[PDB]
Enzyme design. Structure first.
Site, PDB file in Angstrom:
ATOM      1  N   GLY A  45       0.856  -1.193   0.000  1.00  0.00           N
ATOM      2  CA  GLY A  45       0.000   0.000   0.000  1.00  0.00           C
ATOM      3  C   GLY A  45       0.873   1.217   0.000  1.00  0.00           C
ATOM      4  N   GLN A  50       2.901   9.999   1.730  1.00  0.00           N
ATOM      5  CA  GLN A  50       4.240   9.427   1.784  1.00  0.00           C
ATOM      6  C   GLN A  50       5.128   9.855   0.664  1.00  0.00           C
ATOM      7  OE1 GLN A  50       2.420   5.290   2.445  1.00  0.00           O
ATOM      8  NE2 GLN A  50       4.485   5.189   3.432  1.00  0.00           N
ATOM      9  N   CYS A  90       6.101  -0.420   7.192  1.00  0.00           N
ATOM     10  CA  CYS A  90       5.708   0.831   6.521  1.00  0.00           C
ATOM     11  C   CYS A  90       6.879   1.241   5.639  1.00  0.00           C
ATOM     12  CB  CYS A  90       5.440   1.939   7.592  1.00  0.00           C
ATOM     13  SG  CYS A  90       4.857   3.515   6.950  1.00  0.00           S
ATOM     14  N   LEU A  91       6.622   1.652   4.396  1.00  0.00           N
ATOM     15  CA  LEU A  91       7.691   2.153   3.537  1.00  0.00           C
ATOM     16  C   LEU A  91       8.341   3.439   4.082  1.00  0.00           C
ATOM     17  CD1 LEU A  91       5.994   1.634   0.100  1.00  0.00           C
ATOM     18  CD2 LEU A  91       7.738   0.172   1.176  1.00  0.00           C
ATOM     19  N   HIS A 132      -4.199   1.312   7.779  1.00  0.00           N
ATOM     20  CA  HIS A 132      -2.856   1.876   7.784  1.00  0.00           C
ATOM     21  C   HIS A 132      -2.773   3.030   6.789  1.00  0.00           C
ATOM     22  CE1 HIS A 132       1.686   1.151   7.852  1.00  0.00           C
ATOM     23  NE2 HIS A 132       1.585   1.939   6.774  1.00  0.00           N
ATOM     24  N   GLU A 133      -3.242   2.807   5.584  1.00  0.00           N
ATOM     25  CA  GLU A 133      -3.137   3.866   4.584  1.00  0.00           C
ATOM     26  C   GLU A 133      -4.028   5.031   4.893  1.00  0.00           C
ATOM     27  OE1 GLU A 133      -0.678   3.435   2.851  1.00  0.00           O
ATOM     28  OE2 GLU A 133      -0.482   1.250   3.030  1.00  0.00           O
ATOM     29  N   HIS A 136      -2.272   7.281   7.215  1.00  0.00           N
ATOM     30  CA  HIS A 136      -1.250   8.186   6.644  1.00  0.00           C
ATOM     31  C   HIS A 136      -1.868   9.505   6.157  1.00  0.00           C
ATOM     32  CE1 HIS A 136       2.540   5.982   6.453  1.00  0.00           C
ATOM     33  NE2 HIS A 136       2.030   4.905   5.873  1.00  0.00           N
TER      34      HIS A 136
HETATM   35 CO   LIG Z   1       2.897   3.099   5.800  1.00  0.00          CO
END
Ligand SMILES: [Co+2]
Length: 165
Positions: A45, A50, A90-91, A132-133, A136
């Site tokens: 995702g 981000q 998480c990226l 999660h997304e 963000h």
């Molecule tokens: Co993330």
């Protein structure tokens, strides 16, 4: 094009995304570049926050074959139930994972890449990823559910990884 993903402790990750006004060609290009970035970084995702695009856009692909593109533009949570958790990564917090509390099931509404409204009921991994997304987009990271000590340790570990380059 592959876009640059922000890493903690960047304050741009804490910005609240504005709603997309219209799903036009520009927004479609952002969705496509977000998928290219997500797959290049080996994630499931990605939220536009981000990549420093502060609009309510999320791309997700949790499929085994990496061929199921889910786009959430201006998502809204309609219902949720239960509780669960897995050790999330998480990226934007490279190489760190931690168990976080999430709803087990969610129902959302959003716009797709064509600007079409749709509803989606999710459970399991997909439900966790959507939560999660969506976090963000309001400047919330998974580490925010952890103790202050653990947040400190995670930030220190990421800064070290980035210093080593
Ligand atoms: Co993330």
């Amino acid at each position: 094009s592959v876009l640059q993903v922000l890493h903690i402790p960047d304050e741009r990750l804490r910005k609240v995304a504005k709603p997309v006004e219209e799903v036009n060609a520009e927004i479609q290009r952002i969705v496509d570049d977000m998928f290219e970035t997500m797959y290049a970084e080996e994630g499931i995702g990605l939220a536009a926050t981000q990549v420093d695009i502060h609009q309510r856009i999320i791309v997700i692909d949790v499929s085994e074959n990496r061929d199921e593109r889910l786009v959430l533009i201006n998502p809204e949570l309609l219902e949720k139930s239960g509780e669960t958790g897995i050790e999330e990564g998480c990226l934007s917090i490279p190489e760190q994972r931690a168990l976080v509390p999430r709803a087990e099931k969610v129902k959302i509404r959003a716009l797709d890449r064509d600007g079409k409204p749709f509803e989606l009921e999710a459970d399991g991994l997909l439900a966790i990823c959507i939560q999660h997304e969506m976090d963000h987009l309001v400047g919330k990271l998974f580490m925010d559910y952890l103790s202050p000590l653990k947040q400190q340790r995670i930030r220190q570990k990421v800064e070290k990884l980035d210093r080593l380059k």
